[PDB]
Design a protein around this ligand. Structure first.
Ligand SMILES: N#Cc1ncc2nc1OCCCCCOc1cc(NCc3ccncc3)c(Cl)cc1NC(=O)N2
Length: 268
């Protein structure tokens, strides 16, 4: 018998798209603040097995570089996923178009990203859509991974399953998802962390998509690093990007090896 907090007022929009939106919410009492993803389960096909799968995965999660799940309310047919509020905003907005950000800052964000991904992969979960818009800064300006709407489980019982499904955001997607039927999930997330890195350091994405029909991508395979955005990236992290942006997912650097990378371990 103690009523007053858990009734949230939708204070303002944060980022709306085609599924509802996200609202900063404040408890009418505790004054607690949270992010609320609004989503109407309209019909039954692109939801009954979409938003539900997202809640399922959010419950498994618990790491400091992963946005927190505080429950959900499915009263009628509208879904409210109470999620951790990160007043720092999206990593996207700290990237100065065509400039990026101070290398030290990028290195710190990359470490937190790697810690988050290391965490996820360890519990057999793959995000499948890592990008600056999905990476948020909390009140301390520390990076946390969010939106697991496209995420899934690939390992468990100590057994790894292979993927084949083609999802994600083009510019940030790995080539195997465009030329292979099946593929390991971990290598894809790493590839995407590599694109985020490029963006933080260069303030621009390398290509529109990873295909030989894309010049920018072809130039990369040909080592034309005198071309943007590479020319804007110091040789140390560029050397790491060379290890991450490898077409053959079997020859791609693993996370345990990125942590052994010089630039990665460099005191900046
Ligand atoms: N799935 C999922 C998910 N879980 C937790 C959160 N967002 C999610 O959604 C991620 C895509 C959301 C778009 C980014 O949202 C946001 C946008 C802005 N800036 C808005 C702003 C404030 C002041 N001036 C300019 C812009 C802020 Cl300050 C926070 C969030 N997001 C959150 O606090 N939490």
């Amino acid at each position: 018998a103690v009523p007053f907090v858990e009734d949230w007022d939708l204070v303002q929009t944060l980022g709306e798209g085609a599924y509802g939106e996200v609202q900063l919410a404040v408890n009418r009492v505790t004054e607690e603040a949270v992010a609320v993803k609004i989503v109407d389960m309209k019909r039954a096909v692109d939801c009954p097995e979409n938003i539900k799968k997202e809640i399922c995965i959010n419950k498994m999660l618990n790491h400091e570089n992963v946005v927190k799940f505080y429950g959900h309310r499915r009263e009628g047919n509208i879904q409210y996923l109470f999620l951790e509020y990160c007043s720092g905003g999206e990593l996207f907005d700290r990237i100065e178009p065509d400039i990026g950000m101070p290398e030290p800052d990028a290195q710190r964000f990359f470490h937190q990203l790697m810690a988050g991904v290391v965490y996820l992969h360890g519990i057999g979960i793959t995000h499948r859509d890592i990008k600056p818009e999905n990476l948020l800064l909390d009140e301390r300006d520390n990076l946390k991974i969010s939106d697991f709407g496209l995420a899934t489980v690939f390992r468990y019982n100590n057994r790894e399953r292979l993927l084949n499904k083609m999802c994600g955001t083009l510019p940030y997607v790995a080539p195997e998802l465009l030329k292979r039927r099946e593929f390991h999930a971990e290598p894809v997330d790493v590839w995407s962390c590599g694109i985020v890195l490029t963006a933080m350091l260069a303030g621009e994405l390398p290509w529109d998509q990873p295909s030989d029909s894309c010049q920018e991508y072809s130039d990369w395979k040909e080592k034309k690093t005198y071309l943007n955005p590479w020319k804007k990236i110091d040789s140390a992290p560029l050397a790491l990007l060379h290890k991450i942006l490898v077409e053959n997912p079997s020859a791609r650097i693993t996370i345990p090896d990125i942590k052994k990378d010089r630039w990665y371990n460099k005191p900046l």
